[PDB]
Amino acid sequence: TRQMILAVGQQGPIARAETREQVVVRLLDMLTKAASRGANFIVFPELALTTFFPRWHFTDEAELDSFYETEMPGPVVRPLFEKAAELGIGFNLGYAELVVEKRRFNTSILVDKSGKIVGKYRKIHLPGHKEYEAYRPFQHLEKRYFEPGDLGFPVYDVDAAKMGMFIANDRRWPEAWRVMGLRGAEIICGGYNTPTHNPPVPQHDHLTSFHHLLSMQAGSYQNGAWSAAAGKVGMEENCMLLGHSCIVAPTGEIVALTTTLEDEVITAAVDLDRCRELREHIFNFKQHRQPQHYGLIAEL
Amino acid sequence: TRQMILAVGQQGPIARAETREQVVVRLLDMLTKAASRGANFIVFPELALTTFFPRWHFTDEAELDSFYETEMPGPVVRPLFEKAAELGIGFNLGYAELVVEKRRFNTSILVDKSGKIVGKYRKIHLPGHKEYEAYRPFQHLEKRYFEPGDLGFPVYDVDAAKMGMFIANDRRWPEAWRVMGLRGAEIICGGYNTPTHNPPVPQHDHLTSFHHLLSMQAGSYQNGAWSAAAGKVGMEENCMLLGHSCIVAPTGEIVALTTTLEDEVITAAVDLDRCRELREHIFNFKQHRQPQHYGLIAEL
Numbered sequence A, B: 001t002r003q004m005i006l007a008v009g010q011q012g013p014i015a016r017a018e019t020r021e022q023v024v025v026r027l028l029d030m031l032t033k034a035a036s037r038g039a040n041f042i043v044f045p046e047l048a049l050t051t052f053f054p055r056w057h058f059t060d061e062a063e064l065d066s067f068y069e070t071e072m073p074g075p076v077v078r079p080l081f082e083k084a085a086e087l088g089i090g091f092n093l094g095y096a097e098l099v100v101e102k103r104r105f106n107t108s109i110l111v112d113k114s115g116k117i118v119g120k121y122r123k124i125h126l127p128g129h130k131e132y133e134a135y136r137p138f139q140h141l142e143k144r145y146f147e148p149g150d151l152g153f154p155v156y157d158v159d160a161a162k163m164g165m166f167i168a169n170d171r172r173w174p175e176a177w178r179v180m181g182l183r184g185a186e187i188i189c190g191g192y193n194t195p196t197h198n199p200p201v202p203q204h205d206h207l208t209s210f211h212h213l214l215s216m217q218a219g220s221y222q223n224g225a226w227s228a229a230a231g232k233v234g235m236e237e238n239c240m241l242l243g244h245s246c247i248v249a250p251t252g253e254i255v256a257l258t259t260t261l262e263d264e265v266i267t268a269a270v271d272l273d274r275c276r277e278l279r280e281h282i283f284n285f286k287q288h289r290q291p292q293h294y295g296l297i298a299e300l
């Protein structure tokens, strides 16, 4: 009822020449191993169907569009939904969304154990830069290839659980966590592509892991929420991406952690009633919060 | 100019029978050792002039009032201001404020190196409970003995530095940090009386340190602010108070930490320009924040 097993399916590199068909096989295998370890839900990474294309400057718009989905699911990704419904396991999938009216989003969905899309979220905090910067060995052009999401920070019923979505950079922003905490989220999940080199601030490179885990622990604790972060990790097209995919308790304790830079599955026992230990005491919102003093946070 | 040395003056226990006169001696000694180690400012704890009286139920209102200050400074505390002006060192002092119009506040002030009170703050987030609870070996009746502060989260010029104040429980609330981060605080400082036993949630007792330090590191990182937390610590009137008084860099790295449960002074080199490493890149607020999605945080 209130007890489930949450899984994270960390992805090793996806090369530029690796088809969605070859990625779906890798996702199917991880989704199968999570079932066999008793998982009811598995979190997959940000932009989980392709290489991280925002590392390149594009001149050809057909080449750029080829990394986006025009439908969800499409025939190549459909087998992942079919297998999820067969095994009775929900998932969180990140992908690049192209909607033609041409709007571009960094998107994620929640799929329940029936294989039904129960909710969508579009990345609101876009990191990196807008224009090509030649000094960078690799680019991070999310501000060019995506518009900021227009759906807000919703929380959806997924089987037994109140679940909210972040995408990568969102996890560093207390406002993203707090909104979803105020909407009663019991699990906050998403994925990331996080380089271990930041060209403008290389003096925080050795803190990549620290800053990632610090963000997940603080968000979980301050909102008494279970959380899970699914990385795409390792040497991808000669850029190193941070590992340390994780599941976190509402106390902010890390209860599971990846140790490889490859396809790796981790699981943890989730008790949704454990949110109360914070939300009815230390972080009893109605009882403690003084929102008349917080107005500057919501000012445009 | 943009470089200073920040000190923290951690306090061991203050017994019920220990006069303000005997505490000022202890504060003078710590303030002298900080000067000798090149400190330009020292952070002192919450309610630094008395035992932590909110651990007891009071029936007599004269007995309760005796723990509050009706003026700041008074003659007994005046020597601490005089010594601060002589040595050229500012301080942050917490005390119980009684103002008659009768209003009761958990208060802290910033004093610059001239010995002039440059800013006041009143604790906005009150923890614990309102009525006596007999099962508790000790009470935490801040909701009875204080009203929520009415000054907001201001940020003040103190010599070369933009400084904001929290008081104890405030440090667990992202909203307190964020408001002061948005007002351009370079240092966020205050003190705490944090029991290592929480009677309603004893299953988080072993996490007292973790939760304290997690709050300071995450606040600092997410706002690119220097921070400092001054504890009153050790066995005070048979209640154990958490140590681990700390200074933290804008990266959320702990740059100094106490290891005793006694009067202890720690210092760190503060470079106020280091805020830019976060505030001009990863946490470039104007460039990244989407406050149209954050409205629920400011709803009453």
Ligand SMILES: NC(=O)N[C@@H](C(=O)O)c1ccc(O)cc1
Binding pocket: A046, A127, A128, A140, A167, A168, A169, A170, A172, A192, A193, A194, A195, A197, A198, A199
């Ligand atoms: N994919 C993302 O949203 N990645 C960002 C993040 O994880 O917050 C990130 C972090 C460090 C960088 O050098 C670039 C981008």
Ligand SMILES: NC(=O)N[C@@H](C(=O)O)c1ccc(O)cc1
Binding pocket: B046, B127, B128, B140, B167, B168, B169, B170, B172, B192, B193, B194, B195, B197, B198, B199
């Ligand atoms: N002075 C304070 O505000 N103390 C509170 C805090 O530090 O958050 C606190 C923390 C844990 C408890 O079990 C009781 C009270």
